[PDB]
């Protein structure tokens, strides 16, 4: 196994996605980084995207 590699990879990337949408603050990137589970990276990333528009 290694979901850690995916975990690492989802965090890097969500962050790029958010950056592309014009989110600019480590407050949010830090939170992605605290994640611990890919599913949560995803949901957190989507909630931010919804919240920003």
């Amino acid at each position: 196994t290694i979901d850690q590699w995916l975990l690492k990879n989802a965090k890097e990337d969500a962050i790029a996605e958010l950056k592309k949408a014009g989110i600019t603050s480590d407050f949010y990137f830090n939170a992605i980084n605290k994640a611990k589970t890919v599913e949560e990276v995803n949901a957190l990333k989507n909630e931010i995207l919804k919240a920003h528009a």
Binding site: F27, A31, K34, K36, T37, E39, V41, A43, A51
Partner: protein, 556 residues
């Protein structure tokens, strides 16, 4: 494929059981033999839909399937909408009697005569008397129901065994259903955002070691489960529940340490267990919220970029540190923060403007603390019954336009808070109390809404979900209410009170008490206590008479 999908995911029995629940809740005024028929005949259809996927109509869109099977103004109606017709006509307090279980022998006989049909009937019955009952918990209660007959029905004293089991089952259901009713109300009257907020507060209290991101996961998926469930999509609801328990039981490491035992259980018991689990211990050393939420040079920049998440994290951080606050209180704090940021991030010097937010929270905390404390002192001195009696007067004097049945039902329920919560240490009281109150006030709101008679109640039910309890408690007596004229009949009692349970008998006494307050809203207090004592006495007198029981006439 969709109806295969679900059958495949749920299993025959669960699939079977839920669709029967589905119909019951859609179609409340239709018999058991109808309902059962169309469950098998969608179930025959499903079984085929699995084996070859692509049969003529396995294509069809789930509503469409159930919508077509019911008909045999809403069956005339066209789609993405005909479905909405159903959940509309879904109504609260049905136009149906009390169950009043027939007899322990009568039942066990029926139970043996058909284990299955019997159990299939329990579902039907509860399903139809509460059309927002949370389907997957219903299955759980069914297994508890089946277990109770599968234990007592062989015994010499079936009665001393079965009843106590069943009664705690009835009570467990009523609690569960109201609880669900509030989730549906939140969603359907105040929207997804509110529910999500509620879910962030509860889950953060309950999973305080979880990171926010995992809490977003739980909330987003929890919110689907209830969206769908409250919206009648009971399979997709039930399966998404299963999925979320799946996800939760795999990442225990990173949600809570209190789940291993829950997560060592059969599906039906698993979610239920998880749903009820002790809050986890919060992490040992948590920085104050000051840094992120008041001191940071970037509060407003962060807030502008994604308001709902910003407030979300706020709510998460507060809640995880405050297992002792009720959920609604928490939401009021978030609301307070929010309206401060909406005011202050407009200002020339936002920082100055919100430096003191945390000070605003104190009176907001104090207020429920003080209240519960008073009501518990009162409960302590009165006992359950007289405490309910005290509330009846209070509430009836507040909103006398509300119907009598409603006032009795709601006030008895408010009174049961005290037995529920005053017991605990003043430190677990608030979540216990304020959150149970919410649920009771909700019941009041939803009942009231079908026949709005009081603007004061409507207003409190509508302005704000989270302030309902404060709003209702802020009501003074309605000094403009015109007392209805007297009916020496509603204040007589008849011989059949004698043969009723104390509780039913209580419900009569309280019914009369309410009626009296409506008639003489001014004269009150000791009088009213003294009225109940007399009631609860010429009953327990007239019934001891063995003097043609006409005696009741002879107190009229």
């Amino acid at each position: 494929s969709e109806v295969a999908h679900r059958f495949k995911d749920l299993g025959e029995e669960n699939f079977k059981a839920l669709v029967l629940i589905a119909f019951a809740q859609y179609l409340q005024q239709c018999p058991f033999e109808d309902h059962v028929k169309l469950v098998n005949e969608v179930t025959e259809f499903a079984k085929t839909c699995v084996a070859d996927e692509s049969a003529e109509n396995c294509d069809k869109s789930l509503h469409t399937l159930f919508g077509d099977k019911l008909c045999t103004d809403c069956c005339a109606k066209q789609e993405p909408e005909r479905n909405e017709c159903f959940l509309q006509h879904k109504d609260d307090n049905p136009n149906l009697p009390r169950l009043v279980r027939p007899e322990v022998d009568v039942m066990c006989t029926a139970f043996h005569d058909n284990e299955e049909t019997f159990l299939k009937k329990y579902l039907y019955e509860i399903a139809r008397r509460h059309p927002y009952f949370y389907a997957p918990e219903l299955l759980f209660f069914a297994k508890r129901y089946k277990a109770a007959f599968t234990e007592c029905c062989q015994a010499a004293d079936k009665a001393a065994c079965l009843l106590p089991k069943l009664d705690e089952l009835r009570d467990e259901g009523k609690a569960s259903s109201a609880k669900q009713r509030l989730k549906c109300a939140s969603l359907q009257k105040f929207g997804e955002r509110a529910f999500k907020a509620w879910a962030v507060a509860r889950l953060s209290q309950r999973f305080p070691k979880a990171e926010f991101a995992e809490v977003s996961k739980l909330v987003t998926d929890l919110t689907k489960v209830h969206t769908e469930c409250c919206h009648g999509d009971l399979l997709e609801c039930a399966d998404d529940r299963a999925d979320l328990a799946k996800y939760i039981c795999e990442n225990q490491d990173s949600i809570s340490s209190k789940l291993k035992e829950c997560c060592e259980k059969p599906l039906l018991e698993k979610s239920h267990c998880i749903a009820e689990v002790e809050n986890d211990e919060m992490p040992a050393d948590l920085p104050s919220l000051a840094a992120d939420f008041v001191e940071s040079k970037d509060v407003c920049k962060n807030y502008a970029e994604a308001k709902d998440v910003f407030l979300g994290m706020f709510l998460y951080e507060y809640a995880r540190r405050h297992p002792d606050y009720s959920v609604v209180l928490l939401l009021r704090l978030a609301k307070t923060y929010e309206t401060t940021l909406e005011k202050c991030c407009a200002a020339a010097d936002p920082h100055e403007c919100y430096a003191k937010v945390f000070d605003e929270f104190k009176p907001l905390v104090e207020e429920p603390q003080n209240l519960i404390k008073q009501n518990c002192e009162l409960f302590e001195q009165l006992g359950e019954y007289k405490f309910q009696n005290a509330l009846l007067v209070r509430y009836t004097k507040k909103v006398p336009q509300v119907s009598t049945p409603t006032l009795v039902e709601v006030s008895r329920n408010l009174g049961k808070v005290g037995s529920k919560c005053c017991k605990h240490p003043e430190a677990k009281r608030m979540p216990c109390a304020e959150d149970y109150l919410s649920v009771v006030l909700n019941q009041l709101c939803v009942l009231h809404e079908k026949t709005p008679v009081s603007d004061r109640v409507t207003k409190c039910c509508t302005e704000s979900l989270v302030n309902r309890r404060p709003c209702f408690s802020a009501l003074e007596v309605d000094e403009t209410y015109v007392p209805k004229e007297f009916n020496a009949e509603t204040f007589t009692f008849h011989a059949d009170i004698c043969t009723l349970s104390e509780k039913e008998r209580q419900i009569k006494k309280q019914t009369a008490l309410v009626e009296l307050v409506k008639h003489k809203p001014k004269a009150t207090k000791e009088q009213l206590k003294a009225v109940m004592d007399d009631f609860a006495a010429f009953v327990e007198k007239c019934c001891k008479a063995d003097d043609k029981e006409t005696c009741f006439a002879e107190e009229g």
